[PDB]
Amino acid sequence: IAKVIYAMMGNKFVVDVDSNGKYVWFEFVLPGQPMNQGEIWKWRKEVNPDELHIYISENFSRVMDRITEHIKYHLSQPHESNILNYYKKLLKAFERSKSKIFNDSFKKGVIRQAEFLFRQRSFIQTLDTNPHLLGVGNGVLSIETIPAKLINHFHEHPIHQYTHICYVPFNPENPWTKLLLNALQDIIPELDARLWIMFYLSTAIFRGLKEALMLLWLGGGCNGKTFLMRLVAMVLGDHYASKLNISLLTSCRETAEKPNSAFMRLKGRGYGYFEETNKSEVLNTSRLKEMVNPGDVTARELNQKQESFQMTATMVAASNYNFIIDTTDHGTWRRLRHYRSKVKFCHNPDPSNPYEKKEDPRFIHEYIMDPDCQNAFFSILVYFWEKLQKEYNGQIKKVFCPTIESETEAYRKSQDTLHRFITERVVESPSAETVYNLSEVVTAYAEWYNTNINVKRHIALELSQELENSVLEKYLQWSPNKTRILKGCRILHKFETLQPICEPKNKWWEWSPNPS
Amino acid sequence: IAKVIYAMMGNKFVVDVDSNGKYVWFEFVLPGQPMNQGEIWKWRKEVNPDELHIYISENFSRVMDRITEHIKYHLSQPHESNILNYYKKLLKAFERSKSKIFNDSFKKGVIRQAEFLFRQRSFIQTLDTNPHLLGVGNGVLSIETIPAKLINHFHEHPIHQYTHICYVPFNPENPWTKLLLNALQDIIPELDARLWIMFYLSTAIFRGLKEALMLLWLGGGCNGKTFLMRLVAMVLGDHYASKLNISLLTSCRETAEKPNSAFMRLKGRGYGYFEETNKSEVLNTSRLKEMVNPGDVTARELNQKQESFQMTATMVAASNYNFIIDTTDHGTWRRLRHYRSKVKFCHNPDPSNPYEKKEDPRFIHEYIMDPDCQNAFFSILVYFWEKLQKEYNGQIKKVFCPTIESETEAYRKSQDTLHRFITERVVESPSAETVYNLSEVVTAYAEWYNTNINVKRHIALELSQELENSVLEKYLQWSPNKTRILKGCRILHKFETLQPICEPKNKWWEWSPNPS
C-alpha cells in the first residue's frame, strides 16, 4: 500500500530526519480543514500522522471496492473452467486480505514502511533559509520584488514559522493608520530623525545579513520609549523577535565552565531589544563587537556543545539612565548610534511648552492587543521598508540625517574620563616645577576616576599609551634612563585653579527627494 | 536473503560499531542519486538503512521472477509423474513465501541478520587518519604528491569529513584571484613577511604532526586583521577549522570537577585563531607549552571520559592591545613568533602616506559568502603550500625572513620587567651604600611593578634567582652568615635624577629567486 499511498498524497506529507534521529512528519495545510488560527498555506510539524491513518482506512477502501467490482465483472462474463477456478481462488484470497487495512498493527507497519518513500533529503536545513519570505496569518508575504507580493494559494516554498498578524496593503485612510501616524509624529518632532528611526526599524523584517549598526536612545522618563519598541516585538511575534537581558552586556567575561544560555538567542530572530534597566551600568567592551558584527557567533547554552551560527537581528537599547563607554578605538564608536528624546509626557500639560504633552496611558495598557492596530502597524512598516529599498537600495548608512551623527559625536565627546581629567587637573606650568615621572599621572587619574565616576580596577601599563595619545603628547619628554616623563604641568587636588529644520505640509511619510 | 543482498552491493554499504556499541551504517555516495550539496564521491554516515530497504523490494524482486519462470519451464518439459509432483510442491511452497519480502518485520529481521555480514572490522577508528586527503565539494583532493590530484571518480580511501568548497586549478587570470592578490599585497607591503605569512597559513590544510609554532601579530586597529583570519576559517569550514576563546588563554587553571569542553577541541581541526577580544589581557605562561607542542593532550568533557588525542593545528593570534608574557627560559620564547602591522585603514585617506589606505568595508560585510572568491582563495592556498613543499621540504623553520625573528627578538627585549626596573631605579653605588640585606630590591620592585604595570602576587624564591641571572650578578656579594648580600648598589627611590628589502616587478607570488 505504501506505493499507492505515495500516489495518494505525494504533495501533502514530507518525512525528514531530525538531529536526534527520530523521523518527523510535516504536512501542508489547506483551507477548509481542522486547523489552528492563521497557519493557512504553511507547513506544520507533526509526530504521528492522523490524516494519513484516516485516509488509509476511509478513502483507500474505495479502490479495494473498485478492484472487487472489477473481479465481479470479469467473473460474470463467460469463460473456461480453469480461468473461473483461478478467479475464484484470487477472489477468496483478496477477500481474506481485504479486512487487514483496518487493523492497528498493520496500519502502523504500513506507516513505518511508507516513511521511507516520503523522505526528502535536505528539508530541515533548508527551512526558512530564504530571508525574503514571511509567514503571516493569511498566507505568505514575499519581499523579493517591489511591491511585496502576498501568496495565498499552492506553492513550493518551505516555510514553517510564522506570525499571526494578517497583512493588508498600506491604506493611509484607515483610522488606525492615521492615529498611529499622528502619535508617531508627536513622539519625535524632528522629521529627519523620524524618517531615520522608521527606516532603521523597517530592516527588522529582513533576516539575512545586515550592516553592523547599534541603536541606543536615552530619555529622562515617561517618554515614547517602551511603547513602539514593545509594539514592534508584539507585531513580529515571538518567532521573529525576542527580548534580551541587559546582563548580556554588563556581565564580565565568564569562564568556559559557565554555560551562557542567552547567547543562543537571536537564532533566526531578526529583532532583539533590551528593556529599560533600573540603574546606570558599565559596559565591559566585550559582547559589543561580536553582537554588532555580522560574522559568525558561537556559544554553548546548557548541557550542549559549542555551536556556530549567523546572527542577523536589529538591536535597540533604551534606558532612563545613562550608559558607560570607555574606549576610543575606531573599530567601535563607529558602528554605534545614540539618540536623546526631547519630549516629555505628564498628566497636566504645561502651556506654551511644545516639548511636553499629556500622556495617554491607554496607549500602553491597551492598543497592543487590538489586532487592527497591529495590522496597520505592519502595513506601515512594510511600506517604509519598500521605501528604503526603492530609494537607498537597502543601504541604511546612505540615508542622511543631520541631527544624527551630530548628537552621536557629541555623546562621543562625553564618556571620555581621561580628557576630562586632563582638563580638570593639569595646567600649563611655565616654570618652577618638576617632571613628575609617569606613575603620578596614572595614579591621579585612577583616584579621580574612583572619586568622580565610579570605583573600578585599572592597569597602570595600559593607561600610558593613551597618555601619549592624549593632548599631553607635546609635553611628553624622554629621559636619560629611557623613560617617559611629563613637563609643563601642575598636578592639582582641589579647585585652586588660580595660579598665574523643516516640517511637512500634511504628510511626512510621503517624504521629499532630498532628505526632509 | 542476507547473503544474496551482501552479494548485491558489497561495495556500497559498510557496518561498524561505535563506542556506545550501537551499529552504524556508512554509504558511498555516487553521482545521480539524492544527496545534499557537495558530498559526492565521499562516504556518509547513516543510522537506519533506507536505500537498502528500497533495494530489498525493488531490484531484488526481479531475481525471484527469474526463479519463478524457470520452474514453469521445468514444469513445461514433459517428465515422470513424481518429478512433476515434486516441482508442483516446490512452486506452491515458493509462491506463498514470495510475498514475504514485503513484510516490514521480515525486512527488519533480514537487515538485522545482514548487519553481521556487512561488518568491516577496524573502519571507524581508521577514518581520516591519512592527513593527505581532503573532502571537497567536487570530490576529494590528495596532496600526497606534486601536483595535487583531484579525484572525482571511484576510489577506496575511507574519508567522511569534508568541506563544501569546489576546487579549481590555480589560475592568476581569474578576476577574484587578481583582486585577492592585490588586496593581500596591500595588507602587508613587506615581500618577505608576506611570503612568510602565506607559507605559515598554507600549513593549515595539513592535519598531521606540525612544527611547534605560535604566531601572534598586533596592530593599532582597523587593519588587515580579522579579515583573512576569518576568511581562512570560513574557507576551511567548521569540519577542519574552529574558533576558540581567549578565556582559554587567560584562565589561570580550572580545578577538578571541570566540565572542560573548549580544552578538548581541535579533533583533526588544523587551524585555530583568536579574534581581537578583551583589552590588553595577560598570559600566565600556562596553556602554551601543551598548546604549542606536537604532543598528545588528554581531557574529559561533559558526561565523558578523559581521552587523549594528538593536537595538530596551526595557531594564530591577533589583538589591538598588548600582551603580557613573563618568562625567560629558552624552551619558551623559541616556539613563538611576533609581528606588528604597519598600515592603517580609514574613510579619509592621507595623501603621500604609503602606510594609510582607504578601507573597503565590502571586504568584510560581503566577499565571504560569495563562493567565487572562496574557490580562488583555496586555489591560492594550495598553490602556496605546494610551493613551500617544493622549496623548503615542508619545514617552516628553514624559510628565510629577515624582518621576522628580528622584530620578534625586539619584542622579547620588551616584556622583561626586571631589566627595565634595574635600569630605572637601581644604579651603581657611589658611596655610603650598605649590603641592603637580601631581596629588598625585589621587595621594592614588587610595588614598582604594581604601580607601573599591574597588580599581582610574587614569590621571593624564584625572583631571587633571576637577580643572579640579571646583570646585577657582578654586584652581588656573599656574607659571613652565608647569605647573598647585594653590594655596589645605590638602590635609588626617586625620579629626579641619579645620585652620583625589495619587491619584484608585478608578481610577488612568483616568489622571486631563492633569496627572494
Place this chain on the structure above:
DNA sequence: TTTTTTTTTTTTTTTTTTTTTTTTTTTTT
C-alpha cells in the same frame, strides 16, 4: 565583597515491548 557556583551536572530515563505466540482455511483426513 568578591568569591566557586552550587547546582548543574547528573540522573533519569528510555522503553519495553511487542515481538510474537496462537491461528490458519484449506488441506487432510
Place this chain on the structure above:
DNA sequence: AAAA
C-alpha cells in the same frame, strides 16, 4: 466435514 472434522482434524492437522
